[PDB]
Amino acid sequence: MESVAYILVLTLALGVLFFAIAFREPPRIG
Amino acid sequence: ITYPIFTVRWLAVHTLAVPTVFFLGAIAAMQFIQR
Amino acid sequence: LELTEELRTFPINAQGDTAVLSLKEIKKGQQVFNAACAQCHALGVTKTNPDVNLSPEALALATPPRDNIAALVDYIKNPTTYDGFVEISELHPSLKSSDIFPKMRNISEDDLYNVAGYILLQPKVRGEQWGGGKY
Amino acid sequence: LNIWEQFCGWVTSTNNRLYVGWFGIVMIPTLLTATICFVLAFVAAPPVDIDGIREPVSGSLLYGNNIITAAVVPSSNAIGLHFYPIWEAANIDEWLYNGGPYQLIVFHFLIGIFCYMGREWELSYRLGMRPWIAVAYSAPVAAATAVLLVYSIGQGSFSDGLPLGISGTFNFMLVLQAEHNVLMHPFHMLGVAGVFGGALFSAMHGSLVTSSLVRETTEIESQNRGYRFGQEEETYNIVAAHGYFGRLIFQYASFNNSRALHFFLGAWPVVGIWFASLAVACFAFNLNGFNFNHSVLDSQGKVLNTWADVINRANLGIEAMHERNVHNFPLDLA
Amino acid sequence: SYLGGRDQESTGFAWWSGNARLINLSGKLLGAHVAHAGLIVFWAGAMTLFEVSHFVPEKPMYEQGLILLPHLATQGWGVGAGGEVINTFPYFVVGVLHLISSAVLGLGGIYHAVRGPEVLEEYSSFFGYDWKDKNQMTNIIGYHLILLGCGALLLVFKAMFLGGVYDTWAPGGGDVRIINNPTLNPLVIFGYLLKAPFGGEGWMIGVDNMEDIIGGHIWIGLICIAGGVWHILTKPFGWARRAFIWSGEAYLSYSLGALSLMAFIASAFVWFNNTAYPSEFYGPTNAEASQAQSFVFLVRDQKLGANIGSAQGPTGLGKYLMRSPTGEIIFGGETMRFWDFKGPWLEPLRGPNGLDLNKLKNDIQPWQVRRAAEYMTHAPNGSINSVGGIITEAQGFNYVNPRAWLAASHFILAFFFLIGHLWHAGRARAAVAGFEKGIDRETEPVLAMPDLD
Amino acid sequence: RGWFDVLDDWLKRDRFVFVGWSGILLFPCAYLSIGGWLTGTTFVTSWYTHGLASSYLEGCNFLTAAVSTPANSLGHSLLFLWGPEAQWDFTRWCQLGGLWAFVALHGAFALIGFCLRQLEIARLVGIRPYNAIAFTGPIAVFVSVFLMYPLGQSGWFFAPSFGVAGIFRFILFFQGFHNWTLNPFHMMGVAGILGGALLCAIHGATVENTLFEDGEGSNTFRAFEPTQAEETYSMVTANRFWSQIFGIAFSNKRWLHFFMLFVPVTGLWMCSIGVVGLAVNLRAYDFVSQELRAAEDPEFETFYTKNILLNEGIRAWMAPADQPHQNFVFPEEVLPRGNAL
Amino acid sequence: GTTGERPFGDIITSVRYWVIHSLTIPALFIAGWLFVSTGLAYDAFGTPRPNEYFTQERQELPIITERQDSKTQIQQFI
Ligand code: CLA
Ligand code: CLA
Ligand code: CLA
Ligand code: CLA
Ligand code: CLA
Ligand SMILES: CC1=C(\C=C/C(C)=C/C=C/C(C)=C/C=C/C=C(C)/C=C/C=C(C)/C=C/C2=C(C)CCCC2(C)C)C(C)(C)CCC1
Ligand code: OEX
Ligand SMILES: [Ca+2]
Ligand SMILES: [Cl-]
Ligand SMILES: [Cl-]
Ligand SMILES: [Fe+2]
């Protein structure tokens, strides 16, 4: 079966869309 | 002050201009004529 | 072909005779075809009544037959159904109805004589078009 | 200080992870409703009858279809251009069968895509920058105007005009070629040359910096590393990159100063696509690309085949096959 | 000390951005607009002077592809009855009165740009205007608004006094009739503004029964006058002084918005409306022609002896007369989208519910179908160059339907003016904030702000 | 010097057009196939290849003018002017094909001569090339559409025809006969080009949004001596701008430019390996699912089965008129017509 | 910097460039006008004249049928 296979890889892509916004490293100037 | 007349670019710009306005003329001639 | 004279022969009158048509009256017959014979007779199809095509498979079958161009300038003088039963000069451009259809004022008999000669020269030079258009 | 200035002074503040400021006050609610409704209509929306007769066409992942084949599957032909909200439906089953959740992710999305275009202005005033990036975002917000709203207004109903989905985007294009002929149209043909130039000018200027970069590292590490973010010295010498692309084409063919070059990367794709987005806005009113069919012809008067009728013999076949039930009358001018 | 002139290096502006030498020059900016208003007036006569002498009065008005002569025939300069044109001489004199009025509007834009004074302001204390003496800048809007509302009352004195405006809802097709009662009552005309902008309701576009148009310019004339003598007598308020930027460009960047706002709506008056723009002069809209395609095939199959109703289509639905979602019996097929159609023909087929079948049989007269047969072949469907109908049809007739041929040509311009409004508002907000030329070297404003993370 | 070094001191001079020691393969083969193409649009024609009038001489106004193809019954033979078919005759040559053979071949041989050229100037100024690396986008499109697509299929009639509308036929060829949309190798290429078109638009904006204004003037294009080591855009305000609006931001000024190289070059390379699947027509038009209950079940109603009947609208409508090689003629009730249209 | 040859703005401001282009640009333009008004392009290049597409014996849209001797087939058609 297949219907949960799309929703898995969709919301696992959407989880990195949350993580890269919040847990971006701070750029430091030098 | 003394600048040469012919160079490589005199042959570079005449090629694709001597076949340009000879073809411009061809297009005009083709356009006047009818079926 | 060069569009010679003897492929531009077609019977101009009822059932007995033809005539030869020169080149320049066809092109103003083409010009009046693209002005007044135009919005409902592109490619020979009739857009408002969809099976009254100008194909000579179907132009012969409307009685009395519409291949004679003296009959065909009479059938723009007096338009009709396929049987000649009632006039449809309510619903058709004509010279009988010029007060209804105002585009037919700047026209003559000979300005209809060449567009009648134009409209059946076109299926003499092509087979699919002036027909279903998709054959 | 003041109770309302504590708000008006929090929301316009720079130190937040995203800018919530005044264009965001319309944006952040009315785009996130279109986010929540998009994930739910992609998954479990009941089918919606695009054709306007009866036929409920499915585009949700619970109903057996792939993520390529899924859609929001836009609203019905029977509502037309009516405002059909969730409350003028008698029930939500009446809503979702008859084109409900498409208009919820159009009027919420088009509001939320315009206030982003105001929000990109608003921080550029709230910092020291010169504010000319809302005009740069006026190009793919216009593509959101055309095929979502502007083309669906002038064509008639809200039925035609989705990109919503993947295959429904490809179904929408092939009918817009079929119905009214995208291809031989001089705003779309000007528009794709902006994108194809913008394809090249990304790969050209992005190469020529990465070419002419100075040495600051050794071969074993990355060359993306040795300098620090925020430095004032330019990492690549602009005089070396100019006399290489100059040496390639000719000397005055290349931009001597880089500040004029970056205007040209922000000109050629951005002037291009809002000609292509003003193709579809011109296509909204059935002002189509020109037909060269039956153009050349023998002195006999026999037709001569071109490429254009060979496009048309492909174009008539999608027109004679699309919307295979709904046409009762011999012209598709609806 | 200054008085450099017009070069690159005195003003900081180049050969492009080729006006901004005239932001602060008051006098030569007047020579910009008067040469420009002479140029708008020059097109306004010479298009009609080209439209006449490419006109034929026997052929209908939309056929020859002309867009100004249907503007004139709405006011009714010599249209007889039903959309026939009886006299073309008022169409000729209205353009020569614009062709000669461009030359005296052309002398001003060359005197005030070349020979006249550069310092417009410094004079007899009238014009001057420092884009910042607010009390003076409201008087410019006050001088225009008592003239804008006086041009607004020039339509009603055309309609109620000189002959009359054209009316498509007239019995007997359409005819000029002198309107004797426009509506003053604001619960239906200001109630147009409070309506939905969607199908059905139609916010400013569906404005049928022509005596509400003449009621508009009574009510728009008596507000622009009362707005005009507001801005002479008073100043802007306290909140308006601190909410609206207040300088040259921007003080000119607000005209790109409400404008782009104007020709959005004017790209829908020419697309959906059938009473401010008549279909006998402009041609039919998209809603009209698709009802007309279904209508001529109905009365054909009514005359071919076939019970209309009892006909299911190819789909289960009714081929001719199905029902809309809210009960009004409408035309079938793909014409469910234009079920809100309210043209002049088939309004004698409207019953109490809708298209009523007591009168859909035995009350089709031969005038009604031949109008709809005309609009079916004249649908808005064209090419770039000329060729009408659908594209898979060959090129026969050439017809672009100047409803459709005008709707896009404002929508190119209405979209573009929303751009340069937004583009001028950038240079506006960086005019009074001083970073129009970019950020500073030393006092960078980002470094005062703290870290994000 | 020697015998060869005197020649290498010639072609690496500072002439105004740089001729290049790799340019002797370019400059013959790039003036031909530009000027070989420019006679094929005007003078030489089709109508002996596949029955079409595609020249300025027959009178089509450039949006359907193209030097076409050879015929379908002719195979993959390189019509060579002096070849078997050619028989040393200009006429017929072009009339039966040529050109497109000629132009295609010479164009293919040049594109080598241009990518050899930008490698050659890159050593002369010592510059570390990536333009030749970023020309592998453009050379893999040409050799896998105009060259390696027809050699999988039948002979070069099915290759695209050189014109604006001759390409437009080849577009609607690949919709109907192959479904070149919705196979995934094409769809990365739309992510390549449209992703490439943003990243030059969004990078063209911010260098004109963060400026120093060193001059006392107004025009922003001035005050920029090329021999200037201090950098003209901010990157500290631009990172502060895009960390707030989009939430993600380029936190170093290099790899902002490497990403603009990478995003359309790997777009075309994924697009280049799709049409080599189309060359042997491994199309992936069919889904293994979503078709059996398009057969058993009329209640299963989706966009993909709506889209797959549109491609049947291509393959039986234009194919008698596109290919008159087989003389396909159709009796007008075998064609798929949906309804009244 | 400089390149060694004469710049273009110093070329077209010379009278010597335009005495050699008053009878040369309309010389080469009229040479293109005689290429089709004499109909040399109909015979040198292979185009059909727009009265000699279809003959009396041929109406069936001419196509190359055999691969090996295409020239012979073309000659057969006319
Ligand atoms: C009511 C309209 C209006 C007015 C009066 C102004 C006034 C001004 N604008 Mg402006 N602008 C507007 C609308 C307006 N704007 C809109 C809507 C746009 C978006 C398109 C622009 C875009 C624009 C640019 C791009 C910029 C300005 C600038 C300026 C200033 C200098 C103008 C100058 O030098 O011209 C310059 C004129 C030219 C360079 C000529 C260009 C001609 C174009 C290319 C023609 C376009 C095609 C045209 C239809 C012809 C077709 C022919 C056909 C045969 C093909 C001046 C204050 C500048 C500024 O900020 O200064 C303060 C600036 O840099 N304008
Ligand atoms: C609607 C179009 C329009 C109008 C009305 C103007 C008007 C003006 N521009 Mg302008 N401009 C325009 C478009 C326009 N521009 C465009 C598209 C560009 C970009 C190329 C520019 C670029 C530009 C620059 C860079 C400058 C101006 C300046 C000026 C002003 C003074 C001109 C001057 O001193 O030279 C006088 C010019 C002449 C004496 C030459 C003779 C030309 C004649 C007068 C033209 C009219 C002849 C006409 C056919 C006869 C009419 C017949 C009669 C019976 C009425 C003037 C108000 C200048 C300014 O700011 O003033 C200080 C300036 O610096 N403009
Ligand atoms: C937008 C239009 C406009 C504006 C605001 C101005 C403004 C000005 N002009 Mg001017 N002018 C214009 C257009 C304009 N002009 C045109 C089109 C021309 C060519 C005919 C001239 C020719 C012109 C000359 C030759 C002179 C001026 C002068 C002046 C200045 C002093 C005004 C004065 O004392 O007049 C006095 C005003 C009157 C005696 C009242 C007469 C009013 C008119 C004729 C009656 C008609 C009004 C009309 C019915 C209103 C509706 C218009 C309708 C037809 C559309 C002033 C700054 C003078 C100047 O620059 O100073 C040296 C000057 O000598 N103007
Ligand atoms: C086009 C002509 C014109 C122009 C340019 C102006 C310009 C101005 N007027 Mg003015 N005025 C005019 C006509 C005009 N007026 C007329 C005809 C009248 C008579 C009714 C008035 C009555 C008038 C008074 C009574 C006042 C002004 C004021 C002002 C100033 C600021 C406007 C403001 O902040 O309101 C902008 C409006 C808002 C910020 C409120 C939002 C309005 C709605 C809710 C926004 C939604 C609009 C929506 C997008 C479109 C749908 C339309 C409708 C359904 C709502 C400005 C100088 C003010 C001023 O400075 O005092 C002198 C003021 O108090 N005017
Ligand atoms: C703004 C109100 C308004 C509206 C809705 C109309 C509408 C109409 N007029 Mg009309 N007119 C107006 C003002 C208006 N006019 C004024 C002020 C004048 C005098 C110059 C005229 C003079 C006039 C004539 C002489 C004729 C018309 C005609 C017409 C009809 C067709 C033309 C058309 O498409 O109009 C397009 C309408 C618009 C583009 C107006 C949109 C403006 C929106 C609704 C408001 C924008 C506000 C703006 C942004 C400022 C903000 C306010 C600020 C204080 C904040 C149409 C019903 C013609 C017709 O067919 O009648 C028989 C005709 O003959 N009118
Ligand atoms: C007769 C007529 C009519 C009537 C009436 C009228 C004339 C009306 C008008 C009315 C009006 C009178 C309207 C108005 C409107 C308004 C507007 C359009 C405004 C706008 C503005 C804006 C939107 C802005 C705002 C703001 C913001 C947002 C921010 C800043 C601040 C401010 C506040 C400024 C009609 C239509 C029926 C039709 C015909 C004609
Ligand atoms: O349905 Mn969807 O769609 Ca694009 O067209 Mn018009 O209406 Mn139908 O047509 Mn051809
Ligand atoms: Ca006549
Ligand atoms: Cl379909
Ligand atoms: Cl139908
Ligand atoms: Fe940069």
XYZ file of C-alpha atoms in Angstrom, chain E residues 33-450:
418
model
C 2.327 68.633 -18.728
C 0.944 71.180 -21.180
C 3.037 69.645 -23.945
C 1.809 66.309 -22.660
C -1.836 67.354 -22.408
C -1.447 68.793 -25.875
C -0.277 65.332 -26.924
C -3.197 63.462 -25.355
C -5.582 65.888 -27.052
C -3.664 65.422 -30.330
C -4.352 61.708 -30.275
C -7.953 62.291 -29.192
C -8.882 64.087 -32.393
C -6.585 62.417 -34.869
C -7.767 58.948 -33.960
C -11.369 59.944 -34.676
C -10.232 61.882 -37.738
C -8.677 58.604 -38.836
C -11.695 56.583 -37.663
C -13.967 58.740 -39.740
C -12.621 58.358 -43.368
C -11.953 54.758 -42.431
C -15.625 54.550 -41.448
C -18.493 52.988 -43.349
C -21.928 53.755 -41.860
C -23.764 50.825 -43.435
C -21.499 48.199 -41.842
C -21.969 48.016 -38.037
C -19.733 50.044 -35.756
C -17.773 47.234 -34.106
C -16.881 45.646 -37.458
C -14.370 48.208 -38.678
C -12.317 48.017 -35.477
C -12.707 51.432 -33.969
C -12.899 52.429 -30.355
C -13.629 56.118 -30.109
C -16.650 56.291 -32.348
C -18.467 53.910 -29.930
C -17.682 56.369 -27.144
C -19.387 59.149 -29.067
C -22.460 57.113 -29.941
C -23.156 56.395 -26.283
C -23.780 60.109 -25.804
C -25.811 60.021 -28.994
C -24.301 62.325 -31.585
C -26.696 61.365 -34.334
C -27.802 57.758 -33.850
C -31.296 57.046 -35.102
C -32.867 53.904 -33.597
C -31.548 50.413 -32.954
C -27.938 51.376 -33.471
C -28.066 52.748 -36.999
C -25.989 55.868 -37.577
C -27.817 58.666 -39.349
C -25.228 61.482 -39.366
C -21.451 61.345 -39.242
C -20.908 65.098 -39.212
C -21.015 65.442 -35.371
C -18.344 62.747 -35.294
C -16.157 64.829 -37.613
C -16.400 68.165 -35.795
C -15.611 66.697 -32.393
C -12.121 65.676 -33.452
C -11.209 68.831 -35.336
C -12.238 70.651 -32.170
C -9.662 68.395 -30.519
C -7.202 68.719 -33.390
C -7.163 72.517 -33.279
C -7.232 72.478 -29.474
C -3.949 70.563 -29.430
C -2.069 73.322 -31.243
C -2.937 76.009 -28.714
C -2.182 73.408 -26.053
C 1.062 72.808 -27.911
C 2.191 76.419 -27.716
C 2.106 76.369 -23.926
C 4.262 73.310 -23.540
C 6.959 74.832 -25.700
C 6.767 78.347 -24.233
C 6.814 77.097 -20.641
C 9.562 74.578 -21.364
C 11.928 76.727 -23.422
C 11.366 80.476 -23.361
C 9.392 80.812 -20.140
C 10.670 81.061 -16.583
C 12.538 78.255 -14.865
C 11.476 79.297 -11.398
C 7.732 78.774 -11.662
C 7.187 79.642 -7.997
C 9.037 82.951 -7.816
C 6.433 85.163 -9.438
C 3.150 86.803 -8.423
C 2.637 84.570 -5.385
C 0.184 82.205 -7.021
C 1.839 79.170 -8.558
C 5.301 78.893 -6.774
C 4.206 75.865 -4.593
C 6.772 74.230 -2.341
C 5.644 70.622 -2.428
C 5.782 71.270 1.343
C 3.577 74.306 1.965
C 0.612 71.912 2.370
C -1.971 74.717 2.354
C -0.878 75.617 -1.167
C -0.827 72.028 -2.450
C -4.411 71.411 -1.382
C -5.475 74.447 -3.399
C -4.199 72.780 -6.582
C -6.495 69.835 -5.902
C -9.244 72.296 -5.098
C -8.818 74.084 -8.417
C -9.063 70.792 -10.271
C -11.975 69.326 -8.325
C -14.309 72.244 -8.998
C -13.401 71.669 -12.644
C -13.640 67.897 -12.444
C -17.137 68.067 -11.001
C -18.082 70.699 -13.556
C -17.141 68.218 -16.258
C -19.162 65.678 -14.318
C -22.228 67.884 -14.700
C -21.495 68.205 -18.409
C -22.869 64.723 -18.982
C -26.183 65.355 -17.266
C -26.687 68.595 -19.181
C -26.035 66.524 -22.282
C -28.478 63.872 -21.113
C -31.261 65.919 -19.560
C -31.097 68.924 -21.905
C -29.343 68.468 -25.258
C -31.027 65.590 -27.034
C -30.314 62.730 -24.678
C -27.926 59.880 -24.017
C -28.262 56.523 -25.776
C -30.309 53.887 -23.990
C -30.100 50.189 -24.792
C -33.117 49.388 -22.623
C -35.394 51.433 -24.867
C -38.389 49.591 -26.354
C -37.685 48.912 -30.000
C -34.040 47.974 -29.733
C -32.148 50.995 -28.524
C -32.616 54.707 -28.951
C -31.477 58.020 -27.549
C -34.002 59.219 -25.013
C -33.821 62.372 -22.942
C -33.639 61.102 -19.367
C -36.318 62.739 -17.248
C -35.684 61.167 -13.827
C -32.206 60.180 -12.705
C -32.024 58.658 -9.243
C -30.950 60.861 -6.353
C -31.819 58.320 -3.655
C -28.535 57.094 -2.136
C -29.693 53.688 -0.910
C -29.305 52.194 -4.405
C -26.420 54.227 -5.911
C -24.148 54.498 -2.898
C -25.593 51.025 -2.292
C -23.768 49.961 -5.446
C -20.491 50.538 -3.581
C -21.467 48.294 -0.675
C -22.119 45.300 -2.937
C -20.093 42.172 -3.604
C -17.411 42.376 -6.313
C -18.320 38.889 -7.527
C -20.737 37.305 -9.965
C -24.365 37.987 -9.523
C -24.049 41.225 -7.618
C -21.255 42.954 -9.530
C -20.029 45.904 -7.410
C -19.608 48.841 -9.797
C -19.984 46.989 -13.068
C -23.564 45.798 -13.161
C -25.155 49.203 -13.295
C -28.222 48.570 -15.539
C -31.240 50.887 -16.077
C -29.284 53.873 -17.552
C -30.945 56.516 -15.320
C -28.601 55.291 -12.548
C -25.627 56.362 -14.669
C -27.020 59.863 -14.957
C -27.780 59.649 -11.256
C -24.085 58.915 -10.745
C -22.753 62.104 -12.262
C -25.300 64.162 -10.410
C -23.980 62.573 -7.237
C -20.359 62.618 -8.369
C -20.685 66.206 -9.512
C -22.184 67.430 -6.262
C -19.438 65.787 -4.189
C -16.416 66.797 -6.269
C -17.714 70.362 -6.141
C -18.196 70.134 -2.372
C -14.817 68.464 -2.140
C -13.334 71.167 -4.327
C -14.422 74.068 -2.137
C -13.250 72.093 0.884
C -9.631 72.107 -0.214
C -9.616 75.793 -1.101
C -10.871 76.903 2.281
C -8.985 74.545 4.573
C -5.594 72.912 5.187
C -4.922 69.196 5.737
C -5.643 67.927 9.215
C -3.354 66.968 12.054
C -3.447 63.240 11.405
C -3.001 63.694 7.659
C 0.158 65.751 8.201
C 1.792 62.816 9.998
C 0.386 59.901 7.981
C 0.917 60.974 4.345
C 4.467 61.533 3.232
C 4.516 65.112 1.858
C 6.902 65.553 -1.076
C 7.179 66.056 -4.888
C 7.417 62.517 -6.374
C 5.348 60.770 -3.676
C 3.019 63.796 -3.585
C 2.872 62.340 -7.057
C 3.183 58.597 -6.187
C -0.472 58.475 -4.967
C -1.788 59.070 -8.540
C -0.170 55.766 -9.695
C -2.254 53.820 -7.115
C -5.893 55.028 -7.284
C -5.121 55.202 -11.038
C -3.907 51.743 -11.507
C -7.043 51.471 -9.393
C -9.080 53.289 -12.042
C -8.100 51.273 -15.083
C -8.594 48.009 -13.261
C -12.265 48.984 -13.026
C -12.176 50.390 -16.549
C -10.834 47.006 -17.650
C -14.116 45.609 -16.319
C -16.590 48.249 -17.510
C -15.486 47.359 -21.016
C -15.505 43.647 -20.312
C -18.695 42.849 -18.404
C -21.035 45.846 -18.651
C -23.754 46.094 -21.306
C -25.317 49.472 -20.469
C -22.496 51.996 -20.135
C -20.928 50.465 -23.212
C -23.680 49.346 -25.611
C -23.266 46.122 -27.512
C -24.731 47.674 -30.658
C -21.681 49.950 -30.922
C -18.847 48.164 -29.116
C -19.834 44.588 -29.825
C -20.947 41.835 -27.480
C -19.160 40.724 -24.363
C -18.102 37.216 -23.417
C -21.292 36.759 -21.418
C -23.496 37.910 -24.284
C -22.087 35.803 -27.101
C -22.165 32.530 -25.197
C -25.809 33.023 -24.321
C -26.352 33.952 -27.960
C -24.747 30.738 -29.215
C -27.161 28.744 -27.086
C -30.084 30.962 -28.080
C -29.907 30.666 -31.865
C -29.595 26.884 -31.614
C -32.619 26.810 -29.322
C -34.944 28.651 -31.702
C -33.590 26.574 -34.583
C -34.528 23.381 -32.749
C -37.758 25.003 -31.632
C -38.530 25.691 -35.292
C -37.306 22.224 -36.233
C -40.147 20.775 -34.163
C -38.635 19.518 -30.914
C -39.825 19.905 -27.327
C -37.067 22.058 -25.851
C -37.337 21.076 -22.200
C -37.729 17.313 -22.514
C -34.308 17.317 -24.166
C -31.586 15.891 -22.028
C -28.206 16.736 -23.452
C -25.173 14.557 -24.054
C -24.579 14.465 -20.304
C -27.849 13.878 -18.494
C -28.257 17.634 -18.084
C -30.613 19.697 -20.191
C -29.264 20.568 -23.618
C -31.089 23.881 -23.869
C -32.798 24.981 -20.645
C -31.395 23.639 -17.392
C -31.592 25.308 -14.007
C -28.982 27.436 -12.261
C -27.952 26.764 -8.584
C -30.457 29.368 -7.405
C -33.500 28.456 -9.375
C -33.556 30.871 -12.319
C -34.022 28.767 -15.448
C -30.969 29.496 -17.575
C -29.417 28.420 -20.846
C -27.729 25.044 -20.888
C -24.358 23.653 -21.808
C -21.252 25.630 -20.917
C -23.310 28.797 -20.351
C -23.866 28.176 -16.653
C -21.074 30.651 -15.921
C -22.819 33.540 -17.681
C -26.155 32.826 -16.063
C -26.171 36.400 -14.707
C -26.553 37.812 -18.227
C -28.884 40.787 -18.526
C -28.667 42.153 -22.062
C -31.425 44.011 -23.891
C -32.542 41.062 -25.987
C -33.940 38.094 -23.955
C -35.116 40.548 -21.316
C -38.423 40.075 -23.180
C -37.884 36.378 -22.403
C -37.450 36.954 -18.665
C -40.479 35.812 -16.715
C -40.912 36.000 -12.947
C -38.606 33.055 -12.316
C -36.406 33.514 -15.383
C -36.411 32.245 -18.952
C -40.050 31.237 -18.889
C -41.320 28.530 -21.217
C -44.783 29.989 -21.751
C -42.993 32.794 -23.594
C -39.901 30.931 -24.787
C -42.245 29.280 -27.230
C -44.622 31.522 -29.247
C -42.809 34.783 -28.418
C -39.583 34.665 -30.404
C -39.866 37.331 -33.081
C -37.512 37.531 -36.113
C -35.712 40.598 -34.757
C -34.504 38.805 -31.607
C -32.661 35.839 -33.125
C -30.869 37.826 -35.853
C -29.349 40.040 -33.176
C -28.134 36.997 -31.270
C -27.018 35.325 -34.489
C -24.945 38.438 -35.108
C -23.322 38.315 -31.664
C -22.578 34.593 -31.996
C -20.381 35.116 -35.041
C -18.968 38.298 -33.469
C -17.794 36.746 -30.209
C -14.750 38.167 -28.422
C -12.167 35.771 -29.823
C -9.319 37.082 -31.929
C -5.696 36.826 -32.903
C -2.991 39.452 -32.426
C -3.337 40.756 -35.947
C -6.975 40.553 -36.998
C -8.442 37.110 -37.329
C -11.609 36.337 -35.394
C -13.418 33.252 -34.187
C -11.531 30.307 -32.780
C -7.947 29.643 -33.807
C -8.607 26.150 -35.163
C -11.000 27.825 -37.593
C -9.255 29.151 -40.718
C -8.787 32.819 -41.487
C -11.881 34.178 -43.182
C -13.398 37.241 -41.572
C -11.138 39.635 -39.703
C -12.607 40.979 -36.462
C -11.030 41.548 -33.045
C -14.225 42.700 -31.150
C -13.117 46.058 -29.656
C -14.580 45.255 -26.268
C -11.876 42.595 -26.014
C -9.384 44.607 -28.023
C -9.653 47.500 -25.540
C -9.895 45.504 -22.296
C -6.402 44.076 -22.580
C -4.873 47.361 -23.711
C -5.865 49.026 -20.481
C -4.855 45.967 -18.480
C -1.333 46.223 -19.861
C -1.422 49.822 -18.671
C -3.250 49.218 -15.402
C -0.778 46.563 -14.359
C 2.224 48.697 -15.353
C 0.960 51.658 -13.392
C 0.735 49.581 -10.208
C 4.425 48.822 -10.741
C 5.675 52.380 -11.037
C 3.441 53.459 -8.207
C 5.158 50.866 -6.025
C 8.482 51.835 -7.600
C 7.916 55.526 -6.931
C 6.786 54.803 -3.376
C 10.224 53.328 -2.768
C 11.955 56.543 -3.831
C 9.243 58.416 -1.927
C 9.914 56.837 1.421
C 13.642 57.140 0.797
C 13.197 60.808 -0.095
C 12.416 62.025 3.407
C 14.555 59.343 5.037
C 17.709 60.233 3.147
C 18.913 56.827 1.999
C 17.748 57.088 -1.615
C 21.406 56.721 -2.629
C 22.016 53.707 -0.388
C 23.296 53.012 3.097
C 26.062 54.915 4.836
C 29.664 53.791 5.102
C 30.208 54.662 8.763
C 26.780 54.727 10.457
C 25.342 51.428 9.340
C 21.868 50.950 10.853
C 22.007 47.153 11.005
C 24.999 47.108 13.380
C 23.030 49.010 16.021
C 20.475 46.211 16.007
C 21.300 43.104 18.070
